[PDB]
């Protein structure tokens, strides 16, 4: 009757080859390897919410936006009095490296870098100005412009 | 001083909450008021080693 | 019962041959390579708004 006992041990040996302790070892190594593949190299960019004044006079350098791959950046447009300035339209140079979402009435354009460091620029025609605003979108910086408060040079329809 | 506790630690940034409700994010090298400058950020253990020898952990009531 | 032991060493070395060090380094070299992809020839043009 001892053959039943051998077969039983070989049974726990093959049917459940991974005894509960190996189950948690292998859970753990899966867990660590996944931490590693999910681990961002170096310096994750610092999430900063900034405000800047847009100079439209000739000779002024267009405002910069620091991005990061796969993260949303909210560009909000305000006039000199800080009031909202709803967006008329926009033209996005290089839309293959940045993706732009914008509900057609509001004054917020939201940008994500679909690529790590490929930078470009963006023209934004606003309601009240004959002159739109050009902005340079550079991803892969040591911080993310999580939101930016664009203080345009002119005055909007809100005062 | 003001006691800080980590709310969220990953490789890189470490997001901290002070005793006053102030919330910060720090680097391998960054200045902390009172605690000095960061020397190491261990996200696996959730510890932060600063220059003054103080060790930053998760809150006793949040870990 | 040590057969299970050496088998399991061989296991975590084949199913996850990427020990958590070489995968982070592999990510490192990947993003450095695509940074070399991204790096423009020399100085980029200066962004100027003229009249």
């Amino acid at each position: 009757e001892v053959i039943d006992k051998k077969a039983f041990k070989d049974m726990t040996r093959n049917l459940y080859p991974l005894n509960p302790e190996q189950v948690v070892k292998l859970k753990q190594i899966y867990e660590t390897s996944e931490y590693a593949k999910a681990a961002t190299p170096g310096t994750p960019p610092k999430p900063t919410a900034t405000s800047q004044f847009v100079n439209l006079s000739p000779g002024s350098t267009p405002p910069v936006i620091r991005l990061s791959q796969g993260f949303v950046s909210s560009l909000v447009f305000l006039d000199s009095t800080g009031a909202p300035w709803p967006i008329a339209a926009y033209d996005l140079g290089d839309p293959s490296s940045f993706n732009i979402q914008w509900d057609k009435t509001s004054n917020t354009l939201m940008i994500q870098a679909t690529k790590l460091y490929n930078y470009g620029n963006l023209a934004v025609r606003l309601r009240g100005l004959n002159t739109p605003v050009m902005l340079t979108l550079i991803p892969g910086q040591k911080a993310v412009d999580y939101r930016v408060d664009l203080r345009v040079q002119g005055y909007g329809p809100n005062a | 001083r003001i006691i800080y506790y980590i709310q969220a630690v990953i490789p890189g940034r470490a997001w901290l909450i002070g005793s006053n409700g102030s919330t910060l994010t720090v680097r391998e090298g960054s200045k902390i008021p009172g605690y000095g400058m960061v020397k190491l950020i261990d996200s696996l253990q959730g510890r932060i080693l600063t220059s003054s020898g103080q060790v930053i952990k998760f809150s006793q009531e949040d870990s | 019962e040590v057969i299970d032991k050496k088998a399991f060493k061989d296991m975590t070395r084949n199913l996850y041959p990427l020990n958590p060090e070489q995968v982070v380094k592999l990510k490192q070299i990947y993003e450095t390579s695509e940074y070399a992809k991204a790096a423009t020839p020399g100085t980029p043009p200066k962004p100027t708004a003229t009249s």
Binding site: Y35, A36, A39, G42 | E28, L40, L44 | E21, V24, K25
Partner: peptide, 9 residues
């Protein structure tokens, strides 16, 4: 610069 998951005591 230090990846703690790449740790070995």
């Amino acid at each position: 610069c230090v990846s703690m998951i790449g740790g070995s005591r």
